[PDB]
RNA sequence: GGGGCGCCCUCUGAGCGUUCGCGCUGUGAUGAA
RNA sequence: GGGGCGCCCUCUGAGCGUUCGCGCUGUGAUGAA
């Protein structure tokens, strides 16, 4: 067992006795997490295992995401919070000085998000439809990164709508698209690429195969 | 004189066309009020803070964030318009950590986000509060399981102690904590596998470390082999599992208790409120129980004329810390406010914990100051 | 108020008040939300009187759906201050229950048959 | 006339210089005898089968596998020599599966290796039998834990059933097996996650599958979400863990029971023999208890003049299968042979289970044939 | 989850949802094993996880052992049986028609071996010193493969001694040596290589790093 | 035999046999390993007689270390067949105990003082 | 022949089956929870 | 070990503090485990 600092801030890698590497986050709240993810100690500090197959974000990092906008003190709007797995890790990366506003739709899942957001005082959970940013306009704040992972056919302009509401100028956006691999570059993803180019700037398009054999992420800068 | 109207958790803020604060009315730090007004803001009803703000400015034209409000504000006789993502509304949120202190909603950043946290949790439970019904019975099953786990731990730890005493009799009386005992059996096994640095990795002071290792060599117990160790470890690790499951169920309990009956929870706590529902049968059956019945939910003491008698409710820190003579007068006050809390959650109403705790605090202080 | 199931005329409202007053020196009544709820559960209650101006409303909102279960009628009064002083008290009461009518036996039997018409 | 002597589990075999069998005396299929003679062979004492073999050949010169025997065979007046890895001794072992049948030690290959298995286990427990003393007390703690686990399972399963009935009331009466119930909660959770092919993967007949899924749609229970599922699963998986730990302790029990008191074990079984030691306190205290005391180790029935009265020992298949009138006469016979088995293991003696079971079998058959 | 047949008989590989490969053996006795190793089902048959870091043999297989003498119906003499972990897997590979005679020295460990050898009717446990094959000459049989893994300085000729007792002609031998890696081939291991070349034939020398950072295995044919 | 603590002369061996025979019609004795062990535990036993030729030896090996604990002397006899027929039985006995000496009161008191010398 | 205190109060202790030859038995017959 | 009637159904129900102005109180005073 060994814990090594990686390129991206507050994100680590975990060397194992069997040789395998699993992504690592600094556990912001010790003692808990309990049953599910594996807990590990190395030189005093407690760390949490970040599986790259459950998390689309963790997939993207292993998939070679060049620049990660989520770091220490980052404020994020997370559209598609779900059961809380993936945000708990951004909660860890963000640290206490940054904040995570999470918006999830189905009640069946939000109740789980609550438990996660209970112990972590940087996650602010919200039961709301992402199509109506007016509904949480009154609760949230202007953020630095827009993470959008909704089970909708029209995600692209649901995010855009949300962006001109809360996303800071010169900010960043991580979109999740149900995207297939050849030797062009982004001509394949022009439908969703050009739709943004009306008011956004494309940086990276990343196909999540084989970590997620369906989706792909588009990192974008807001003008 | 055109005013841009911002409605937020902190209150209502009037801006000019260039993002300068013209006037503000600050929301009070009450979770119950802000939550309810936020639900109204979705339908288009403005904050009472907005009505007050608009009264003390009476502008030429107002422009609101939300289009659902336009008619409701035109009903008061104001000229109302609607911009969605206005350059003003953004500027407000760009400086949101600061303006919260600037309008005197909070003293610093920490307690603002500590408020916003308590809120975000409450608000998103109110939209759940018109629930998928049966939730109270689940909490009952959750708190009963915790009692079933605690009762199990004692059974396994006793058996683990009696088993392990064969290899190490000195350890049984050295640590009365059942958890720590099982931890030593888990990672070590044989006595001669214990080091000075291995024991500090669990958080032990030097005065007990030198008692254990001195007893390790001076052990009267017989030599043991890896059959027994692997067998003892099975129970030892299960004890450690149950100790986690109990702490984890307690976290689940809080999430259900604050969702189904949040007003009862704010008074007594998650665990005590859960245990009250267990005796009643359901949430509705707690509301039908009057103030006098709640106070005596031990059932064994009244039927004579249980363990920790005059009310099961006395586990409350104000009846436990305070001396024996005040206990009668406090138990009534708690049960009276518990009665309200039950009925208000049975209707599935708002949050009144912030006033009920302050109402109980005033009366507890009025009992302590009467000698 | 949302816990008020039916509209109550002012004539029957004052005739209810007089029915309780008579039972304070000829019969036996219970005063206060706690005791009133204890009367309906046991089955000793004949008529339940509920105040309309209670805040927060939730303190008595359980009674109407409890009284329907044990088949006991209930009537609303427009004021809590007018129900408090009527019950021989110096403070206001939220709900009252009648166990023994006394000299208001014919007055109660008229009330219970007038409220059943405005229900359905 | 030079003879190469081979001593083995099957018996004593005399070979010529070229690997041809000259004469053999076959060992009887008694575990007790072969084990004891094998311990003697380490010190150099030959098998009684060898003494008999050498008598019926009286060779010019004998050559033995083991150098410890040379003096002990020269004491009888034979010319003895020693080859270690002799070409003869190998040839014997090259054809060992066959020669076992050829010298008529066994009828076929299967039961030979089935004997060699029972032996290899016994032999290597005899070298352990002069034990690091305290082993009996461990077995007591092992069997008490099994009773503590069984008592726990019932507590958790009852709680799991009452909890899960909120989501699925129909399931509680459909499966009376506590294990299967917890398995369904573990891998599935929500009712609508069950398929026809998912249920066969656990070993269910078609007559009950169509009862479950028909009750899944016709469920009166309320909708549940993943808080409750993850909470219910904690108990459900723990029940499945304990069900494993119990079966695993039972395997550990056998390993201790056959080591510390193998003669008691051969009569009643591992579990029944363990449970007898629990009441006594130790192995020595079972030996001091006479035949009459063992028979009445219920202690509650005798003190009146317990659950399944006249002796705790009646769980034995011969007192349980046979009718009510024979039970008095069999209970004595078992307790009499149990008395011997206790004392013979208290001295830490040989294995006499193969004769004691045959001695009890003859007397049980003599009770059944008297009408 | 998926189970695929490998080069060696009765030995499988286990594809996982997280991608990792763990060696696999056909569980000869179902229902049991219980607490410790992980139990898995695939198309009716039950399989047992074979960890390559605990087992020296499993290390050697992953380390690229070309030819494995242990297959279906193999009779083995296992010198250094220990707690039973590794033999249980050869028990599985061997199947009911082959046999495993296990010799372990320290009582503290044999008692565990017994429990393992209890449920498996092809393992024949023996408390004995491997320096004295006379002590079990009377119990065992002539075998096909000699596995030797003893905590001794003189293993090499302890095995040789055992071999001329029980190992069949044309048979095989797996020795474990406390053996460092450069670009010769077996000049490094000449001390133990030449000692065998007096009556044995070397086939493969395999350094177990990093599965076992100390030991190495020498597969040998007996003349 | 290894459970035999001390060497017993044949003269005292036959004088022990005669002491039990007399107690069968003048006193009370217990016959058999089971009853003999029950006598020593209760404290009713005065003298314990053990057979030397018992197989397996382990059936009676507990008695000598039990009788030392409750301070009761014990003597060995060379044959079990000679102890069986002496006790008025047709089968052999492994051990016998005396509770009431009867006409062998002086014969037992001589035995208990002759065995204490060959012990130490 | 009658009653209050402590003690050992941890089944009983010699027979049963039989073809009338003899068998199984204090290394526990038979009687009980 | 099995069933039909009434009862407690699981505190009491109006007072207490006071500087004699008035305060806290049936949205529970006081008396009890
Ligand atoms: C594929 S999941 C995201 C998984 C997440 N990264 C994790 O592992 O924790 C997408 C989620 O978006 C939610 N969702 C669907 N429609 C939504 C909407 N209109 N607004 C907000 N969330 C929505 C769904 O409930 C679904 O669980
Ligand atoms: C390194 S361990 C083998 C581990 C084994 N492969 C496993 O994981 O199950 C070697 C074992 O050989 C045993 N041993 C030591 N000396 C021995 C001897 N003289 N004869 C037989 N076994 C011996 C030791 O008890 C030790 O546990």
TrEMBL record, chains B, D:
<dbReference type="InterPro" id="IPR012976">
    <property type="entry name" value="NOSIC"/>
</dbReference>
<feature type="domain" description="Nop">
    <location>
        <begin position="260"/>
        <end position="369"/>
    </location>
</feature>
<dbReference type="InterPro" id="IPR045056">
    <property type="entry name" value="Nop56/Nop58"/>
</dbReference>
<dbReference type="InterPro" id="IPR002687">
    <property type="entry name" value="Nop_dom"/>
</dbReference>
<comment type="similarity">
    <text>Belongs to the NOP5/NOP56 family.</text>
</comment>
<dbReference type="InterPro" id="IPR048896">
    <property type="entry name" value="Nop5_56-rel_N"/>
</dbReference>
<dbReference type="Pfam" id="PF21572">
    <property type="entry name" value="Nop5_56-rel_N_Arc"/>
</dbReference>
<dbReference type="GO" id="GO:0030515">
    <property type="term" value="F:snoRNA binding"/>
</dbReference>
<protein>
    <submittedName>
        <fullName>Pre mRNA splicing protein</fullName>
    </submittedName>
</protein>
<dbReference type="GO" id="GO:0031428">
    <property type="term" value="C:box C/D methylation guide snoRNP complex"/>
</dbReference>
<dbReference type="InterPro" id="IPR042239">
    <property type="entry name" value="Nop_C"/>
</dbReference>
<dbReference type="InterPro" id="IPR047099">
    <property type="entry name" value="Nop5_N_sf"/>
</dbReference>
<dbReference type="Pfam" id="PF01798">
    <property type="entry name" value="Nop"/>
</dbReference>
<dbReference type="InterPro" id="IPR036070">
    <property type="entry name" value="Nop_dom_sf"/>
</dbReference>
């Amino acid at each position: 067992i060994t814990v090594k600092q990686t390129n991206m801030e507050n994100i680590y890698e975990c060397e194992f006795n069997d040789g395998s590497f699993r992504l690592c986050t600094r556990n912001l709240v010790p003692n808990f997490n309990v049953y599910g993810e594996r807990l590990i100690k190395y030189e005093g500090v407690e760390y949490r295992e970040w599986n790259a197959f459950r998390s689309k974000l963790a997939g993207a990092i292993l998939k070679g995401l060049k620049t990660n906008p989520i770091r220490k003190g980052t404020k994020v709007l997370y559209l598609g919070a779900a059961s809380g797995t993936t945000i708990s890790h951004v909660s860890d990366i963000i640290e206490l000085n940054g904040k995570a506003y999470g918006v999830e739709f189905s009640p069946r899942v939000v109740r789980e998000l609550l438990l996660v957001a209970q112990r972590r005082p940087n996650i602010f959970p919200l039961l709301a439809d992402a199509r109506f940013p007016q509904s949480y306009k009154s609760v949230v704040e202007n953020v630095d990164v827009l993470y959008v992972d909704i089970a909708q056919p029209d995600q692209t302009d649901i995010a855009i709508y949300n962006a001109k509401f809360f996303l800071k100028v010169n900010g960043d956006m991580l979109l999740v698209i149900k995207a297939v691999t050849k030797d062009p570059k982004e001509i394949y993803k022009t439908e969703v690429e050009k739709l943004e180019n009306s008011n956004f700037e494309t940086i990276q398009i990343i196909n999540l195969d084989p970590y997620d054999k369906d989706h792909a992420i588009v990192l974008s800068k807001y003008k | 004189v055109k005013i841009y109207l911002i409605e937020h958790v902190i209150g209502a803020v009037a801006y000019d066309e260039n993002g300068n604060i013209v006037d503000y009315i600050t929301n009070p730090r009450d979770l119950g009020k802000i939550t309810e007004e936020l639900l109204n803001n979705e339908k288009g009803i403005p904050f009472s803070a907005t009505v007050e703000l608009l009264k003390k400015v009476n502008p030429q034209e107002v422009v609101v964030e939300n289009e659902a409000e336009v008619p409701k504000l035109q009903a008061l006789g104001y000229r109302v318009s609607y911009e969605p993502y206005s350059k003003v509304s953004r500027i407000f949120r760009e400086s949101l950590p600061k303006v919260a202190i600037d309008i005197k909603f909070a003293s610093n950043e920490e307690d603002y986000y500590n408020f916003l946290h308590e809120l975000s949790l409450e608000y998103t439970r109110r939209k759940l509060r018109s629930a998928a019904q049966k939730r109270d019975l689940l909490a009952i099953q959750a708190v009963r399981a915790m009692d079933d786990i605690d009762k199990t731990i004692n059974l396994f730890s006793e058996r683990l102690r009696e088993w392990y005493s064969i290899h190490f009799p000195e350890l049984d009386k050295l640590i009365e904590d059942h958890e720590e005992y099982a931890t030593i059996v888990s990672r070590f096994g044989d006595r001669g596998f214990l080091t000075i640095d291995s024991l500090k990795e669990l958080g032990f002071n030097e005065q007990r470390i030198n008692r254990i290792l001195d007893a390790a060599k001076k052990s009267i117990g017989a030599d043991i082999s890896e059959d027994d160790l692997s067998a003892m470890r099975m129970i030892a690790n299960t004890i450690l599992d149950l100790y986690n499951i109990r702490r984890n169920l307690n976290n689940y309990l809080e999430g259900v208790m604050k969702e189904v009956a949040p007003n009862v929870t704010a008074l007594v706590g998650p665990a005590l409120g859960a245990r009250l529902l267990s005796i009643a049968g359901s949430l509705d059956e707690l509301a039908k129980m009057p103030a006098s019945t709640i106070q005596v939910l031990g059932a064994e003491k009244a039927l004579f004329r249980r363990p920790p008698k005059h009310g099961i409710i006395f586990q409350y820190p104000a009846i436990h810390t305070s001396p024996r003579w005040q206990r009668g007068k406090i138990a009534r006050a708690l049960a009276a406010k518990l009665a309200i809390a039950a009925r208000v959650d049975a209707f599935s109403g708002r949050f009144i914990g912030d006033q009920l705790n302050e109402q109980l605090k005033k009366r507890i202080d009025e009992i302590k100051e009467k000698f | 108020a949302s816990y008020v199931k039916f509209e109550v005329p002012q004539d029957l409202a004052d005739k209810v008040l007089e029915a309780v007053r008579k039972a304070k020196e000829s019969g036996k009544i219970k005063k206060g939300t706690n005791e009133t709820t204890k009367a309906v559960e046991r089955g000793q209650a004949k008529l339940v009187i509920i105040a309309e101006d209670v805040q927060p409303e939730e303190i008595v909102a359980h009674l109407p759906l409890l009284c329907d279960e044990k088949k006991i009628p209930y009537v609303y009064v427009s004021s809590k201050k007018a129900l408090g002083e009527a019950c021989g008290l110096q403070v206001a009461t939220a709900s009252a229950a009648i166990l023994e009518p006394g000299e208001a036996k014919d007055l109660v039997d008229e009330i219970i048959k007038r409220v059943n018409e405005i229900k359905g």
